[PDB]
Design a protein around this ligand. Structure first.
Ligand SMILES: *C[C@@](*)(O)[C@H](CCCNC(N)=[NH2+])NC(=O)[C@@H]1CCCN1C(=O)[C@H](N)Cc1ccccc1
Lengths: 27, 249
């Protein structure tokens, strides 16, 4: 389905300012 | 949201606002899971102790809304509710177990750069993502302290080990819930608050780059108190119900 992907971010291959904090928490 | 930051435009496109139709009043948060289904907390609709028991006709929903003041015309959408479904074993008397509800929109919302549905976890996405220490993201227009913002508030919080959540409260906690928050000795703070219930606790999948809604703001004791992590409805544990509602047969 068309979910979890944001036009202004994932679709532009751009990260938001804090999503790295999330990815890093996985390590 | 307590100790969060202003949301970037388009960063939480599945964000939904639950309003009382008349008089106009922001009631809770919510989330877009399809172009016709909106996920929220049951207590945002039914809570007898607070004289709460809304019907479809009493409410409305706003989507793609960036300012509570301004009306981004061809950006935000307003939809009426066709039907409300509250989990049958929703326990409002004791601990808010199964604090989840689904709201079917009268008419479908067209997806845009500002409105998109969030994914619901499958079994293995939950299995890998639901781990203590892993961080999720909570969003809402509710109180900033135990008024509310003019912009959507965002806060990233770590999932707390079940034994710690259980020891943090006298409420009889269940498997259908989970808590998230920072340790007292750790620097950063953060929590959801009144007005935020119904809002999504989401996580980005490191596997496919998609955002999945792992929880729904449900409850807590005060807001952002040391040793008092806020609680969330465990979306995956309640997926069978969501399925039977959206796929009646
Ligand atoms: C309806 C929501 O807006 C709100 C979310 C509060 C979040 N708190 C924190 N710190 N993250 N939910 C509530 O206020 C719920 C609904 C019923 C009462 N309630 C509480 O959070 C009480 N403070 C505690 C509680 C009472 C009864 C059953 C379970 C919890």
């Amino acid at each position: 389905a068309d979910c979890g992907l944001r036009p202004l971010f994932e679709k532009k291959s751009l990260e938001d300012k804090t999503e790295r904090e999330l990815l890093e928490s996985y390590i | 949201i307590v100790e969060g930051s202003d949301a970037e435009i388009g960063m939480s496109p599945w964000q939904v606002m639950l309003f009382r139709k008349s008089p106009q009043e922001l009631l809770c948060g919510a989330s877009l899971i399809s172009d016709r289904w909106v996920l929220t907390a049951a207590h945002c609709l039914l809570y007898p102790p607070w004289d709460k028991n809304f019907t479809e006709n009493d409410l409305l929903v706003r989507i793609g809304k960036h300012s509570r003041t301004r009306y981004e015309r061809n950006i935000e959408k307003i939809s009426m509710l066709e039907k409300i479904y509250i989990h049958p074993r929703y326990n409002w008397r004791e601990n808010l177990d199964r604090d989840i509800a689904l709201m079917k929109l009268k008419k479908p919302v067209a997806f845009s750069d500002y409105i998109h549905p969030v994914c619901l976890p499958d079994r293995e996405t939950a299995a890998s993502l639901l781990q203590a220490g892993y961080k999720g993201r909570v969003t809402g227009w509710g109180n900033l302290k135990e008024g509310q913002p003019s912009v959507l508030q965002v806060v990233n919080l770590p999932i707390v080990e079940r034994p710690v959540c259980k020891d943090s409260t006298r409420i009889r906690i269940t498997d259908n819930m989970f808590c998230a928050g920072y340790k007292p000795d750790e620097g950063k703070r953060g929590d959801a608050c009144e007005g935020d219930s119904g809002g999504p606790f989401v996580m980005k999948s490191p596997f496919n780059n998609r955002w999945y809604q792992m929880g729904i703001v449900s409850w807590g004791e005060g807001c952002d108190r040391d040793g008092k992590p806020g609680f969330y409805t465990h979306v995956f544990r309640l997926k069978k119900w969501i399925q039977k509602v959206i796929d009646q047969f």
